């Protein structure tokens, strides 16, 4: 290949292999905070009501009655507990993917 002209010849094989692998490697997952701490960077949803409000704002959805009425209707009762319970299960599920 053209780039092989400049680099020492014995470097070419490995690089080629890397290239063939690099087009196949699944992208980098989220970085652990441990690794992020080394980086100089520091620019790496609260409750279902706040989540839905953020969703409406991102979608620009106008509430019909009101957002305050929406928040007051639920008030995090037992029936809605499921949501956070779901969260637990979801995160519990993730514990299987990275044991």
């Amino acid at each position: 290949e053209p780039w092989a002209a400049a680099v020492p010849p014995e470097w070419v094989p490995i690089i080629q292999q890397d290239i063939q692998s690099q087009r196949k490697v699944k992208p980098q997952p989220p970085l652990s905070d441990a690794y992020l701490s080394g980086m100089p960077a520091k620019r790496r949803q609260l409750l279902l009501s706040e989540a839905v409000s953020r969703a409406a704002k991102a979608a620009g959805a106008r509430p019909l009655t009101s957002p305050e009425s929406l928040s007051r209707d639920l008030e995090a009762p037992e029936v809605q507990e499921s949501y956070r319970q779901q969260l637990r299960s979801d995160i519990q599920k993730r514990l299987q993917e990275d044991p």
């Binding site: 989220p30 970085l31 905070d33 959805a61 106008r62 019909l64 809605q80 499921s82 949501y83 979801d90």
Partner: protein, 48 residues
């Protein structure tokens, strides 16, 4: 039976049908991305 049905029922009155569906898809997106960007610190925060 699920948070999705409760949210749909509430949005049926607090938002229009199109707005409710858009908000639902928007939140599904946010949830999926939060799952894609989950880390140990996030798990610790959930524990807290």
């Amino acid at each position: 039976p699920q948070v999705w049905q409760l949210i749909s029922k509430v949005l049926a009155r607090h938002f229009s049908a199109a707005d409710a569906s858009r908000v639902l898809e928007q939140l599904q997106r946010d949830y999926e991305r939060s799952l894609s960007r989950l880390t140990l610190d996030d798990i610790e925060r959930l524990a807290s």
